[PDB]
Design a protein around this ligand. Structure first.
Ligand SMILES: [Fe+3]
Ligand SMILES: [Fe+3]
Ligand SMILES: [Fe+3]
Lengths: 136, 515, 168, 390, 136, 390, 75
C-alpha cells in the first residue's frame, strides 16, 4: 500500500537529498510499473462512490488502493486494476446511472481504461495486445 | 400545389398557441365548479403569464440544470455543506421541512382553484401553479436530502416527515400552510394561499431568509430558494387574478373583506412570531431586526402595493392590522420562551442567545433584557444545557404559574402571564369540552364556526404521559436509539439521552383542569 | 386522565373487537350512525374517546363498505343509501331543509347532522360530495353575512358557552 | 453606496468563516445519512424519486398509511375534512403504496418534456424548409385533418380538466404526482394539435387554423356526439377521484382515445401521404404509454390486489368498467361514421380494415386491463357493436 | 429616489425612536403606494442586465429606480413601472434570450407583472381591472 | 491522514482569503470587458458563437485573414506547411468570414443532439408497447426497408468519411466547426438506420438486422452502383477540401440524398403503413436543412461573391457542379430501378409520381444552389435523363 | 453542471475577483496557450481518422475531433 502514496519514496526527500537520488544513474531510465492511477473530479455522486464503493468493497478486493485528497479531485493509485460498476453506483445513488454517466466525473487515467457493459475498468494490462477487447 | 410552396423556415411560438387557449373550454349545463363557494369567477379573465405546457417544461428545466450544477458540482467540491454555523444548519431542518408542507398542500389548493375558475386562461394560471408546487415540494426535500449527506448533524434533516409530528410548533404550521390552503371557500383558500401566504409572507420566508442564510455560511439555501421564488411570483399573479375575476360579482362587496381579514390574521398569527423566532434566535449573525423586515415587506410594501392599491375596488385595510403590528414587535420573543422551554419535543438543536446576541436584542427591542433576557439567564444558571441538571424549563414555568395554553383555532402557544404580544386568554366550556382561545379574531372564528376547529392539542393527546415516553414513541432519537435529535445546545459533546429527560420527571398536565 | 400511546391502545383494540361482530349491512349502518351521532362534531354526546374516535370511525367504515360489496346488488351501490333510501331523494331532501333555515344556527345544525347520518359508506360518494358541497355554500352565505356585526359578548351568549375565565 | 448594510458572507468572509469553523464539531453527530431512511423501498434500494416524494402528504393515522395524528386544524364549513376517506369508494391498507414505474419526480418530468419542446421547433423549421407539405393529399389536409383532428383537441382538453378535482382530493403524494403529470400531458396534446394547425396555416395560404370550425364539430357533429357526452360525464359528472382516473384513462382513453389517435388519425396519415401528423401523434402515444404504466400500478397491481380490500375494490372497478365501456362503445359507434368521408383503401378504411383496427384496440384493452381485474368481455361482441355504425 | 431606498423613512430609526413611529396611530392602516419592487437573483446574465440595462437606460427613463445589493439577490424599487426587453438583453449577452429565459432569474415581484412579446413589465397599474391584458 | 499536504483553498481559507483580499486592487485596470472585442460582428452585435470561435486558428498574414506572422515552427518533410494556400483551388480575401446561421459552438450542438438521443429511446419504448409494428406492410418491411434502406447507411457512412481530410486541411475555425458537425450528423444518420433495423429485430422474430445483406446490396446491387461510385470518388478521389464539401453536400447529397431519404424511403413509408421510419427520417432531414444553412453561407453567400475572387471561384464551382451533377444523375438513374420492386400507386410510384418527385428535387436544387452561382440547368432535361432508368 | 456552477453559483459568490493577482494573470497565458493545442488537436485527430482503416479506430479519433472543439470553446 504505502508504495502507492503520492509522496512515496523519493518524494519524501527535500533539498540536496532529493537531488542526489533524482540524478542517480539508476533513475535515468524508466522503470516498468504495475500500478494504475485514477483521477476522479469531486462532485456529490463521486464523493459517495469514493466512500461507499472505492474505500469499502474496492479496498477489500484490492488492499493496495491509496486515495488522496487533492482539493478539487481525488487521486487514486492501486496495483493491477481498479474496477467500478456503474450499476452498483446507481443503486447507491438511487437514480439512473449508466457507465457513460460515471464518465461525467472520471477526470484522468494513467493505465489502460475501457468500458464494457455497466463496468469501467482501468488496468495495468496491455488491452488489445495481451488481452483482446470484446463486444457485449 | 405539389411542386410549389413557400420554403422559408418557420416554427410556432408559445404566445401564438396561447392566444387560442380561451376557446378550448365549451358550454354545457353541468360545466361548473364542484367545490362550495360564495363567489362566481367571471368567464373572460385573462392571465398575466402566457405559458403553454412545452414552454413551461423548457423554462423550468433550464432553472433546474443551473441549480443542480451549482449544488452537485461546485458547492460539493467546495465542501460548502459543512461550512454553515451550527445554529443555522439546525434552523434549516425546520424551515425547509415546514415550508415543504406548504408547497405540498399548495398543489391541492391550486387544483381546487383550477376547478373553480371558468375561464380557460385562468385555469391555466392555476395549472402552472399546480406543477410549480410539485417542483417546490421536491426542492425543499432536496435541501434536507443534501444536508443529510453533507452536514455534520443529519438527524432531523433525515426524518422530519415523521419526527415533526411530536411537537407543538408543527400544529400551527399545518393551519397556515396546509389546512388553511385547502379547507374552505375556494376564495377564502385563495386569499390565504396566494394573496397573503405567497404574495405577502414568502418574501420574508423564501427571499429575505437567503441573506440570513448567506450571513451564517449557507449557500445551499440561496441556490434553491431564490429559484423557488422565480415560480412563486407567478402565483402572486394568480392571487390577484382571483380578485380580478370576482370584482364584478355582488357577492364580493358582501363577503370579500371578511374573507381577506380572516386570512390575513390566520397567516400573520403564525408567521409573524415564528419567522421572527427562527431568524433572530436560530442564527448567529443577524441581518437586521425582524420587526424592520416585517415593516419593509409586510406593512409598507405588500400593504401599500397590493392592499392599498386595491382600495379603489372595495378592498379595505385589514381590521386586524393594528393587532398584527404589536405581534411583529414582541410575539416572536414570546414564542422563543415557549420554543426553548419545550426544546425536547422538537427535531433541531437550539442555542440560548450569547452575550453579544443579548446586547443586540436589547439595542433593537429596548426592554428585552429585563423581561426575556432575565429568564434565559436564569435557565442557563439552572443547567438548561447540562444533561445531568435534571432541569427542563417547561416544569419551571408551571412551578412559577406561567402556564402554556394552545389556541384551539391557530394552535399557536400562548403564555398570558409573560406575553407582550397581542392577545388574552378566554376559556369556554361547550357541550362538556373546555376550549382555550387567545385573541378576538380567532375567538369569533370559533364561536361562529365551531365544527371547523376541533383540532386535538398536544396536552389533550399526551395528558399524564412522561416526556421521554412520548419522544421514544415518536422516534425522536438518533440512530443509536437513545440520544435525542433535539438538544438545548449546539456543541458536539454532552448530548442529552432519553434517560436524562426521564430523570426530570416531566409529565404532561391538562392546562384547563384548573378552570 | 392518563392517556395510552397514540396509535395502539386498549380503547381502539376494544372497538375493533365490537366492529368485527357486525354481520349485516342494516346492523352496520345503525352502528355507524349511532357512533357518529354519539362521538363526532361539536354536538357529539360524549368527548370520552376524543383522541381515538376518528381512527375507530375509519374501521367501522371499512366493515360497512366490505359488507356492502358482499351483500348488496351492484346497482344499489350506485343509487341507494344503505338505509334503503333513494340516494337522489336524500339529496333533494337535505338541500330543501337547509334552504328553509332561518338562522345560521339552524343551518349549521342541518349540515352537521346530514354528515353524521349519511357520510360514506352510508350514501354513495358522488351523491354525498355533491350534497355536502351544496349545503356548505348555503351555510357560508348565511354565516359570512355581517360577520363582524355581533360583539363577542353577544356571540358567546348566542352560542351557549359557559364562560369559565376571561383574562383582564 | 446604498442605504442598507452589505452583508458579509459566512462562506468567504475571513472573520465570519473563522468564527464558524471554531463552532463546527470535529465529528458527525449521527451516521444515518440516507434521507427518509425509513421509507419501504419498492425496488432493491431506495430511489431518489421515493425519497423526495413519499410522506410529503401529512396524513394522520386515520387515513390508511399516515404517520401523523389528530384532527386537521381547520376544516370546511360543515365539517368536511381537508382530506378524508369520504373522497372515494375504494379502500386500501396504505395510500402511499403506489409507485410510478418511470419514477418521475418534477425534474425528470420537465427535463424530458423540454427536450420534446425544443426538438419540435427544430423539426418544424426544417419541415417547412423541406417543403414536404407539397406531398399531402389536400382533401385529407383541409377536410379530415383540419376539422376532425382539430375537434379531437376538445376530447384531450376535457380529459385534462377532469383532473382538477382529482388533484385537490386524492390521498397520497405519489398518486397526486401521477395524476398531475397525466393532466398536463393531456392539455399538452390539446395544445400540440392546435400547434400543428397553426403551423399548416403558415404554409398553405387560406388554411383556417381558428378553432371555430373544430369547436362546432366537437359540440354539434354527430361523429363526436358520444365522445363529448362521455367526457362531460367523466369530468363534471362525478367526483370520486379513483373513478375519474380509472374511467378517464383506463376505459375511455384506452378505447376511444387509442382508436381515434392511433388507428384513425396516425394510421391513415400514413396512407394519404401525411408526413407531419405522425410527428405529433408520436408524442401523444408516448405520453399515453407512460401514463398507462402508472395507472396500471395504482389500479391493477395495487388496489385490485389490496390484501384486505382487493375483491371489494374490484366490485367497484367492474361496475365502473361496465358503465364507461358502454359509453365508450357508443362513442366509437358514432365515430366510425367518419370513414364514410374518406377514400376506401383495402385493409385500412374498408369494413375489414376497421374491424381489424377495432380488434387491436379491444383485444389490447382486454389483455392490458380487463383480464387483470376479472372483467369478462367478449371482444367480437364489442367489435360488432361498433361496426353497427360503420 | 431616496424614498425608494430599502432603509427609507422609519427604517433609519432604532430602539425607542423606531417603536414610537411604528406604533403611531397614522401607521395602523396601510398607505397606498405607487412603487413596484423587483427582486433579481444574482447570476452572470442578471448582473450584466443590472449594469447595462437597469442602471443605464432604465434609470435614464425612470430616475426613481434604486438598486440594493442583498448578497444573493438584487432588490430594486421604483416609482410606477419597470420594463425589461428580453430582446435587448439577448443582444447584450450575445446569445438567444426570450422573455421566458429572462424569467429563469427573476425571483420576486411586488406589483402587477406580465409578459407580452419579448417584454417583461412590472407596474403599479391594476392590470385586467383598469387596463386590459392583450394577446400578441 | 494521507502522504501529501491537504491544500488550503484561497477562496474559503480565512488566512489565505485575507492575504488575497489585501492584494486585489480596489479598481478595475481596464474597462474593456467584451471578450475579443475586435472581431467584426456578422449580425447587429457580437455573438457568443463568434467570440468563442473566431481566430482560434493561428493563421499568419500570408493565409488570407490571419493575424499572426512568420513561418510555421515545424512543417512536413519536404516543406508542406501546417496549413497553406495549396490546400484548395478557391481563394478569398478572408477565410474567417464564414458564419453558421444557426451559430453552433460545441455546447448548443451537443445539447440539441442529446435531446434527440433521449427522446428517441422514449419513443421506441412506447412504440413497442403500442404494438404499432403490426400495421406495417410486411413486404415493405422485410424487402425494401431491411435491405435497401439498410444499404443507404453506407452512402451516409461514406459522406461522413469524406470529411476526415476536410477536418485536417481547412483554413479557418468557423469552417472547421461547420465541417465537423456535418460529419457527425452523417455518421449519426448511418447509426440511426442500423438502430431502426436492430429495433425491428426485437419486435419481429427472424428479422435479420445484421449488416451482411445491406453491405452486399450496397457493394454489388446495380440499384446503388452509381451512388457508391460517386461516394468513393468524393471521399477518396479528391483532397481539395472545398471541392469535397461542395460536391458532397451541395450536389450529391442535395440531389440523390434528398431523393432517396425523402422522396423514396420517407414518402413511401407513408403509403405502405410504416409509422416507424418517418420518426428516423425526421432527424436526417432536420440535419440536412441545418447543414444546408451553413454550406449556403460558406459557398453561396461568401465564396461565390468574394469581392476579389467571386468569378474566379464560380469558375471552379461551375466545373465541379457539371462533373458531380452528372455523377449524381447517373446515381439516380440506377436508383429509380427500385420502383420496379414496389407496388404501383398512382401519383406515388407510377411514372407520373416519380417524375413529380424528381421535379421537386431538381427544381428545389436549382433555386437553392444552381441559380445562385450562375449554373445553367434544364430541370426537365435532368428529369428525363433519370426516367430513362425507370 | 459546469455552466451551472459558473453562471449561477460562482457568479453569485463573486468568485471571479477572489483570485490572487499573480494567478489571475497566469491564467491569461495558461488558458489561451492551451487553447491553440485544443484547436490544433481537432485537425490532428481528423488526420488520424483519415489514417486508420478500422471503423472503430476511426470512431475513437472522431470522438476526439469533437472533444477538441469542446475544449477550444472551454478554454
Ligand atoms: Fe411554492
Ligand atoms: Fe406558490
Ligand atoms: Fe483537449
Amino acid at each position: 500500500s504505502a508504495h502507492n502514496a503520492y509522496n512515496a519514496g523519493i518524494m519524501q526527500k527535500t533539498g540536496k537529498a532529493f537531488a542526489d537520488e533524482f540524478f542517480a544513474e539508476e533513475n535515468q531510465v524508466v522503470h516498468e510499473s504495475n500500478a494504475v492511477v485514477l483521477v476522479l473530479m469531486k462532485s456529490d455522486e463521486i464523493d459517495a462512490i469514493i466512500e461507499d464503493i472505492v474505500l469499502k468493497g474496492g479496498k477489500a478486493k484490492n488492499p493496495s488502493i491509496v486515495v488522496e485528497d487533492k482539493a478539487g479531485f481525488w487521486w487514486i493509485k492501486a496495483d493491477g486494476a481498479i474496477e467500478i460498476d456503474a450499476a452498483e453506483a446507481g443503486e447507491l445513488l438511487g437514480k439512473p446511472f449508466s457507465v457513460y454517466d460515471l464518465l461525467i466525473n472520471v477526470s484522468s487515467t494513467v493505465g489502460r481504461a475501457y468500458t464494457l457493459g455497466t463496468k469501467f475498468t482501468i488496468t495495468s494490462e496491455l488491452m488489445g495486445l495481451d488481452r483482446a477487447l470484446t463486444d457485449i | 400545389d405539389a411542386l410549389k410552396v413557400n420554403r422559408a423556415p418557420v416554427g410556432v411560438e408559445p404566445q401564438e398557441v396561447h392566444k387560442w387557449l380561451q376557446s378550448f373550454n365549451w358550454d354545457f349545463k353541468e360545466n361548473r365548479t364542484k367545490y362550495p363557494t360564495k363567489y362566481h369567477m367571471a368567464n373572460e379573465t385573462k392571465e398575466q403569464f402566457k405559458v403553454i405546457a412545452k414552454e413551461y417544461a423548457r423554462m423550468e428545466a433550464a432553472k433546474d440544470e443551473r441549480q443542480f450544477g451549482t449544488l452537485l458540482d461546485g458547492l460539493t467540491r467546495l465542501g460548502a455543506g459543512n461550512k454553515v454555523h451550527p445554529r443555522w444548519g439546525e434552523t434549516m431542518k425546520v424551515i425547509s421541512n415546514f415550508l415543504e408542507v406548504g408547497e405540498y398542500n399548495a398543489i391541492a389548493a391550486s387544483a381546487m382553484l383550477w376547478d373553480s375558475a371558468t375561464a380557460a386562461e385562468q385555469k391555466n394560471g392555476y395549472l402552472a401553479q399546480v406543477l410549480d408546487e410539485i417542483r417546490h415540494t421536491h426542492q425543499c426535500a432536496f435541501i434536507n436530502h443534501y444536508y443529510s449527506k453533507h452536514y455534520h448533524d443529519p438527524a432531523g434533516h433525515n426524518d422530519a416527515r415523521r419526527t415533526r409530528a411530536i411537537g407543538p410548533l408543527w400544529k400551527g404550521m399545518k393551519r397556515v400552510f396546509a389546512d388553511g390552503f385547502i379547507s374552505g371557500d375556494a376564495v377564502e383558500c385563495s386569499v390565504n394561499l396566494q394573496l397573503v401566504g405567497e404574495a405577502c409572507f414568502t418574501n420574508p420566508l423564501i427571499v429575505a431568509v437567503t441573506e440570513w442564510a448567506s450571513a451564517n455560511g449557507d449557500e445551499i439555501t440561496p441556490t434553491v430558494f431564490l429559484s423557488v421564488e422565480t415560480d412563486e411570483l407567478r402565483h402572486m399573479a394568480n392571487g390577484y387574478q382571483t380578485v380580478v375575476s370576482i370584482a364584478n360579482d355582488p357577492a364580493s362587496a358582501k363577503f370579500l373583506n371578511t374573507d381577506l381579514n380572516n386570512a390575513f390574521w390566520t397567516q400573520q398569527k403564525y408567521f409573524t412570531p415564528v419567522l421572527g423566532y427562527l431568524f433572530e434566535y436560530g442564527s448567529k449573525f443577524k441581518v437586521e431586526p425582524w420587526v424592520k423586515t416585517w415593516n419593509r415587506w409586510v406593512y409598507e410594501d405588500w400593504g401599500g402595493i397590493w392592499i392599498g392599491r386595491l382600495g379603489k375596488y372595495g378592498v379595505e385595510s385589514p381590521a386586524s392590522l393594528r393587532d398584527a403590528k404589536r405581534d411583529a414587535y414582541w410575539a416572536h420573543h414570546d414564542l422563543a420562551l415557549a420554543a426553548y422551554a419545550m426544546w425536547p419535543l422538537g427535531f433541531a438543536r437550539l442555542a440560548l442567545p450569547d452575550e453579544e446576541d443579548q446586547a443586540w436584542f436589547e439595542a433593537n427591542y429596548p426592554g428585552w433584557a429585563d423581561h426575556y433576557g432575565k429568564i434565559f439567564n436564569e435557565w442557563k444558571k439552572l443547567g438548561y444545557e447540562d444533561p445531568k441538571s435534571g432541569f427542563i424549563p417547561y416544569q419551571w414555568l408551571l412551578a412559577n404559574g406561567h402556564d402554556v395554553y394552545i389556541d384551539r383555532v391557530s394552535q399557536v402557544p400562548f403564555i398570558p402571564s409573560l406575553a407582550k404580544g397581542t392577545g388574552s386568554l378566554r376559556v369556554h366550556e361547550f357541550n362538556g369540552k373546555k376550549h382555550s382561545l387567545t385573541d378576538d379574531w380567532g375567538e369569533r372564528q370559533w364561536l361562529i364556526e365551531p365544527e371547523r376547529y376541533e383540532c386535538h392539542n398536544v396536552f389533550e393527546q399526551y395528558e399524564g404521559r412522561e416526556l421521554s415516553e412520548v419522544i421514544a414513541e415518536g422516534h425522536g432519537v438518533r440512530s443509536d436509539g437513545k440520544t435525542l435529535i433535539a438538544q438545548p445546545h449546539t456543541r458536539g459533546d454532552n448530548l442529552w439521552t432519553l434517560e436524562d429527560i426521564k430523570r426530570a420527571g416531566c409529565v404532561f398536565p391538562d392546562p384547563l383542569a384548573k378552570f | 386522565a392518563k392517556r395510552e400511546p397514540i396509535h395502539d391502545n386498549s380503547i381502539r383494540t376494544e372497538w375493533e373487537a365490537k366492529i368485527a361482530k357486525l354481520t349485516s349491512v342494516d346492523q352496520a349502518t345503525k352502528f355507524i350512525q349511532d357512533f357518529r351521532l354519539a362521538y363526532t362534531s361539536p354536538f357529539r354526546k360524549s368527548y370520552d374517546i376524543d383522541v381515538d374516535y376518528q381512527y375507530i370511525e375509519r374501521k367501522i367504515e371499512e366493515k360497512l363498505s366490505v359488507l356492502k360489496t358482499e351483500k348488496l346488488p351492484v346497482a344499489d351501490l350506485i343509487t341507494k343509501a344503505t338505509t334503503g333510501e333513494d340516494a337522489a331523494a336524500v339529496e333533494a331532501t337535505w338541500i330543501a331543509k337547509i334552504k328553509a333555515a332561518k338562522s345560521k344556527y339552524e343551518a349549521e345544525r342541518i349540515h352537521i347532522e346530514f354528515r353524521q347520518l349519511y357520510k360514506p359508506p352510508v350514501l354513495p360518494v358522488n351523491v354525498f360530495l355533491r350534497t355536502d358541497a351544496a349545503l356548505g355554500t348555503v351555510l357560508m352565505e348565511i354565516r359570512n353575512t355581517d360577520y363582524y356585526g355581533t360583539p363577542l359578548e353577544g356571540l358567546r351568549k348566542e352560542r351557549g358557552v359557559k364562560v369559565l375565565h376571561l383574562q383582564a | 453606496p446604498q442605504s442598507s448594510q452589505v452583508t458579509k458572507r459566512g462562506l468567504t468572509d475571513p472573520e465570519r468563516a473563522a468564527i464558524i469553523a471554531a463552532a463546527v464539531p470535529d465529528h458527525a453527530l449521527d451516521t444515518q445519512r440516507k434521507y427518509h431512511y425509513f421509507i419501504q423501498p419498492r425496488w432493491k434500494r431506495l430511489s431518489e424519486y421515493e425519497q423526495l416524494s413519499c410522506y410529503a402528504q401529512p396524513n394522520p393515522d386515520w387515513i390508511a398509511g399516515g404517520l401523523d395524528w389528530g384532527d386537521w386544524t381547520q376544516k370546511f364549513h360543515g365539517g368536511r375534512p381537508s382530506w378524508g376517506n369520504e373522497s372515494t369508494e375504494l379502500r386500501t391498507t396504505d395510500w402511499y403504496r403506489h409507485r410510478d414505474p418511470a419514477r418521475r419526480w418534477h425534474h425528470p418530468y420537465v427535463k424530458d418534456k423540454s427536450e420534446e419542446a425544443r426538438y419540435t421547433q427544430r423539426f418544424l423549421a426544417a419541415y417547412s424548409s423541406e417543403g414536404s407539405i407539397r406531398t399531402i393529399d389536400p382533401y385529407w389536409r383541409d377536410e379530415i385533418l383540419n376539422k376532425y383532428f382539430g375537434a379531437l383537441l376538445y376530447s384531450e382538453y376535457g380529459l385534462f380538466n377532469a383532473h382538477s378535482s382529482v388533484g385537490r382530493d386524492c390521498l397520497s403524494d405519489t398518486i397526486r404526482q401521477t395524476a398531475v403529470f397525466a393532466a398536463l400531458d393531456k392539455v399538452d396534446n390539446a395544445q400540440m394539435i392546435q400547434m400543428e394547425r397553426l403551423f399548416i396555416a403558415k404554409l398553405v395560404p387560406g388554411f383556417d387554423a381558428s378553432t371555430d370550425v373544430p369547436k362546432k364539430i366537437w359540440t354539434t357533429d354527430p361523429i363526436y356526439s358520444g365522445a363529448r357526452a362521455t367526457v362531460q360525464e367523466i369530468w363534471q359528472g362525478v367526483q370520486d377521484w379513483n373513478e375519474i382516473l380509472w374511467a378517464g384513462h383506463a376505459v375511455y382513453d384506452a378505447t376511444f382515445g387509442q382508436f381515434a389517435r392511433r388507428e384513425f388519425f396516425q394510421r391513415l396519415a400514413t396512407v394519404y401521404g401525411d408526413t407531419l401528423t405522425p410527428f405529433f401523434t408520436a408524442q401523444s402515444q408516448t405520453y399515453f404509454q407512460t401514463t398507462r404504466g402508472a395507472i396500471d400500478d395504482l389500479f391493477v397491481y395495487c388496489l385490485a390486489n389490496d390484501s384486505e380490500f382487493g375483491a371489494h375494490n374490484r366490485t367497484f372497478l367492474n361496475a365502473w368498467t361496465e358503465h364507461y365501456l358502454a359509453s365508450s362503445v357508443a362513442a366509437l359507434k358514432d365515430f366510425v361514421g367518419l370513414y364514410a368521408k374518406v377514400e376506401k383503401v383495402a385493409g385500412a378504411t374498408d369494413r375489414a380494415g376497421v374491424s381489424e383496427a377495432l380488434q387491436r384496440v379491444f383485444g389490447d384493452w382486454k389483455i392490458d386491463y380487463a383480464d387483470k381485474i376479472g372483467f369478462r368481455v367478449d371482444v367480437d361482441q364489442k367489435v360488432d357493436a361498433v361496426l353497427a355504425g360503420y
